[PDB]
Design a protein around this motif. Structure first.
Motif, PDB file in Angstrom:
ATOM      1  N   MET A   2      38.274  38.131  23.507  1.00  0.00           N
ATOM      2  CA  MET A   2      37.428  37.022  23.910  1.00  0.00           C
ATOM      3  C   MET A   2      38.277  35.835  24.359  1.00  0.00           C
ATOM      4  SD  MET A   2      34.381  35.136  21.776  1.00  0.00           S
ATOM      5  CE  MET A   2      35.386  33.945  20.921  1.00  0.00           C
ATOM      6  N   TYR A   3      37.848  35.210  25.442  1.00  0.00           N
ATOM      7  CA  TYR A   3      38.550  34.092  26.038  1.00  0.00           C
ATOM      8  C   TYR A   3      37.706  32.840  25.956  1.00  0.00           C
ATOM      9  CZ  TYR A   3      40.954  31.203  29.544  1.00  0.00           C
ATOM     10  OH  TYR A   3      41.624  30.200  30.203  1.00  0.00           O
ATOM     11  N   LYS A   4      38.332  31.728  25.569  1.00  0.00           N
ATOM     12  CA  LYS A   4      37.657  30.443  25.483  1.00  0.00           C
ATOM     13  C   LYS A   4      38.402  29.425  26.337  1.00  0.00           C
ATOM     14  CE  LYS A   4      37.962  26.097  23.727  1.00  0.00           C
ATOM     15  NZ  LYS A   4      39.126  25.213  23.423  1.00  0.00           N
TER      16      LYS A   4
ATOM     17  N   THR B 282      31.773  20.997  26.591  1.00  0.00           N
ATOM     18  CA  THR B 282      31.228  22.350  26.486  1.00  0.00           C
ATOM     19  C   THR B 282      32.292  23.427  26.662  1.00  0.00           C
ATOM     20  OG1 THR B 282      29.041  21.652  27.298  1.00  0.00           O
ATOM     21  CG2 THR B 282      29.559  23.996  27.448  1.00  0.00           C
ATOM     22  N   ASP B 283      32.208  24.451  25.820  1.00  0.00           N
ATOM     23  CA  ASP B 283      33.131  25.571  25.869  1.00  0.00           C
ATOM     24  C   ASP B 283      32.534  26.741  26.630  1.00  0.00           C
ATOM     25  OD1 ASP B 283      35.192  24.360  24.230  1.00  0.00           O
ATOM     26  OD2 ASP B 283      33.727  24.529  22.593  1.00  0.00           O
ATOM     27  N   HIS B 284      33.355  27.368  27.465  1.00  0.00           N
ATOM     28  CA  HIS B 284      32.957  28.552  28.208  1.00  0.00           C
ATOM     29  C   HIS B 284      33.614  29.773  27.586  1.00  0.00           C
ATOM     30  CE1 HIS B 284      30.863  26.235  31.172  1.00  0.00           C
ATOM     31  NE2 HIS B 284      31.950  25.681  31.671  1.00  0.00           N
ATOM     32  N   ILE B 285      32.804  30.756  27.213  1.00  0.00           N
ATOM     33  CA  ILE B 285      33.293  31.948  26.532  1.00  0.00           C
ATOM     34  C   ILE B 285      32.957  33.235  27.278  1.00  0.00           C
ATOM     35  CG2 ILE B 285      33.366  33.125  24.339  1.00  0.00           C
ATOM     36  CD1 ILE B 285      34.150  30.243  24.189  1.00  0.00           C
ATOM     37  N   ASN B 286      33.920  34.149  27.396  1.00  0.00           N
ATOM     38  CA  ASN B 286      33.634  35.481  27.933  1.00  0.00           C
ATOM     39  C   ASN B 286      34.497  36.546  27.275  1.00  0.00           C
ATOM     40  OD1 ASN B 286      35.676  34.141  30.120  1.00  0.00           O
ATOM     41  ND2 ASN B 286      36.044  36.347  29.982  1.00  0.00           N
TER      42      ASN B 286
END
Length: 152
Positions: free
Chosen positions: A125-127, A52-56
């Motif tokens: 955006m950061y992944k 799973t990827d976390h994005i913010n």
């Protein structure tokens, strides 16, 4: 992890233009809504919520050029933030192969308001993934107005 804009080719990192249409004639009290969920989607390239990827969105994301005197708000994944961002936002989980439109809206409160072709905002955006090093990636969405906007 990949994204696309308007159903275009996949993006792994870097800076991408996102073209939007804005209300071309507005009044002094009017705020422009930029619904980026209509343009940007991202997905997990494995699916099944394995890695799973976390994005913010990232602190420092701001309006561009002359629009820095404009006031704004940014909606991201059930939280609304003052814009420009003074903080990183909450994290959105990306786990499926199905493209997920970014839950992202920009609210702009501005006789030339915006020029066609002008960058109105730069949203970083950061992944990072859940496995290994996380394979962190940076995206910048350069939001570009398709049209001129006037306020007579």
């Amino acid at each position: 992890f990949s994204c696309n804009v308007d159903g275009g080719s996949s993006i792994g990192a870097g800076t991408t233009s996102v073209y939007v249409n804005l209300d071309p004639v507005i009044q002094p009290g009017q705020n422009l809504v930029v619904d980026l969920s209509q343009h940007i989607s991202c997905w997990n390239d494995y699916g099944g919520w394995y890695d799973t990827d976390h994005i913010n969105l990232v602190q420092g994301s701001a309006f561009a050029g002359s629009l820095q005197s404009y006031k704004g708000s940014l909606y991201w994944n059930n939280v609304t933030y003052p814009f420009p961002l003074t903080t990183n936002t909450n994290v959105l989980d990306i786990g499926d192969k199905t493209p997920m439109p970014l839950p992202l809206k920009l609210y702009i409160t501005p006789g030339v308001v915006i020029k066609a072709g002008e960058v109105i905002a730069r949203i970083h955006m950061y992944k990072i993934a859940t496995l290994g090093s996380g394979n962190p990636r940076n995206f910048t969405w350069n939001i570009i107005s398709n049209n001129s906007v006037v306020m007579p």
